[PDB]
C-alpha cells in the first residue's frame, strides 16, 4: 500500500498496465524507470478503523512527573513500579482499557482479559 519512489529520481510512482504481458509496471512519470508490482493491490479505502490508542510513546515517558503511579507489576520483569495511563486515541466511543508502561522491562501491557 506504500508509495514507492523512483530510485533515480524521488518522485511519486504511478501504476500503469502492460499492454500485452499483463503485468502492473510502476513506470516513473518523470524518468523512464519502470518496475513490476509485487501484488495486484493498488488502491485501498478502509472506511472503518479503530486504531490509535497506543502509540506516541517516548523512551522516557516516566521522566515526566505528572503521570500517576501504581503498584501492579510488569509481567516480564516483576518489578512493582509502573506508569499507567489511558488511551491515546480520543473518539466518542473509545474504551476505558488502560495501558501500563514500566521502566525496568520498558514494556507496554494492558489489563484486558476477554
Partner 1 sequence: DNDEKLIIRCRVVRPAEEDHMLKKIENTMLENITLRGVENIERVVMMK
Partner 2 sequence: NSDSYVLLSVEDDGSFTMIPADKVYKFTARNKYATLTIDEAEKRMDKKSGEVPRWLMKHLDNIGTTTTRYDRT
Enumerate binding residues for Zn ion (CB under 5 A): 6, 8-9, 28, 30-31, 33, 74, 76-77, 105
**Residue 102, exposed/middle/buried by CB under 10 A (0-12, 13-18, 19+)?**
buried
d(CA 48, CA 8): 36
Output the nine-digit C-alpha cell for 7.
530510485
CB of 17 or CB of 110, closer to partner 2: 17
Q: From the list partner 2, partner 1, Zn ion, none, which binds 8 (C-beta under 5 to 8 Å, kind-based)?
A: Zn ion
Footprint of partner 1 (CB under 8 A): 15, 17, 19, 42-43
Amino acid at each position: 500500500t506504500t508509495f514507492r519512489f523512483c530510485r533515480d529520481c524521488n518522485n511519486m510512482l504511478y501504476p500503469r498496465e502492460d499492454k500485452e504481458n499483463n503485468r502492473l509496471l510502476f513506470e516513473c512519470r518523470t524518468c523512464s524507470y519502470v518496475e513490476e508490482a509485487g501484488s495486484p493491490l493498488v488502491y485501498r479505502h478502509e472506511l472503518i478503523t479503530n486504531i490509535g490508542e497506543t502509540a506516541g510513546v517516548v523512551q522516557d515517558i516516566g521522566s515526566d512527573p505528572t503521570l500517576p503511579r501504581s503498584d501492579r507489576e510488569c509481567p516480564k520483569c516483576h518489578s512493582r513500579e509502573n506508569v499507567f495511563f489511558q488511551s491515546q486515541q480520543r473518539r466518542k466511543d473509545t474504551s476505558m482499557v488502560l495501558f501500563f508502561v514500566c521502566l525496568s522491562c520498558s514494556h507496554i501491557f494492558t489489563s484486558d482479559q476477554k
